Ligand binder design. Structure first.
Ligand SMILES: CNc1nc2c(ncn2[C@@H]2O[C@H](COS(=O)(=O)NC(=O)CCc3c[nH]c4ccccc34)[C@@H](O)[C@H]2O)c2nccn12
Lengths: 112, 116
């Protein structure tokens, strides 16, 4: 909640929401790196994947299932890339765990 | 006779093809990538054959989560203390080369944006 993603979860700032349930939220990224670029985040404040608990595994998996269902609904039928960044080397921009989903163009290698 | 399937990754699961294995349990296998794109670059794969994330079942949630937890634990065990990037590729636009779900973990250098 002490992050901008917490404000988004609490509906305190605008975000174009794609999907919500009781435990996660998917919304378009404000700084998109592909024609389609959205985030899937848990409502629980996990600061970074490195500190996720064992009992968070189903929740983390849920982010990926939601992400792939959202990608399908957004029409990403030629594919996409999912990304989780950790720490400074990973380029983690917000210390609230987030899954990026990017598509609508060819993604290149290496992935940064 | 051949659980895990006959992609290269299925053959690695059954020890038919060599790999450099970091971690193994009943659900997954972590091993170093043969064409690393960072100083440390490994894969985490399920032992259950799922071809790609787009066809994963709802009841694959815990398994997918387990790949990420195993990924982060392996990253810590390998000493990636400045961080890392996890990547799942889907289909042609994602650059998916092998149709058996896999999580990339890359670290030991600054990763750039965009992620490809
Ligand atoms: C461990 N052992 C091992 N690993 C292998 C083998 N063949 C492939 N892999 C590994 O599987 C990963 C699949 O990633 S992925 O499917 O997500 N796709 C890619 O990685 C391709 C990305 C790409 C997109 N455009 C490009 C343009 C040029 C080069 C690559 C690309 C890659 O990182 C490969 O290095 C193999 N044969 C025997 C043992 N082997």
């Amino acid at each position: 909640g002490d992050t901008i993603f917490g404000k988004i979860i609490r509906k305190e700032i605008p975000a174009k929401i794609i999907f919500e349930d009781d435990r996660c939220l998917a919304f378009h990224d404000i700084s998109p790196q592909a024609p389609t670029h959205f985030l899937v985040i848990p409502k629980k404040h996990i600061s970074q994947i490195s500190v996720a608990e064992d009992d968070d595994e189903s929740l983390l998996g849920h982010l990926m299932i939601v992400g792939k269902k959202c990608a399908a609904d957004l029409g990403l039928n030629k594919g996409y890339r999912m990304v989780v960044n950790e720490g400074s080397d990973g380029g983690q921009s917000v210390y609230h765990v987030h899954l990026h989903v990017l598509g609508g163009r060819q993604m290149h290698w290496p992935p940064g």
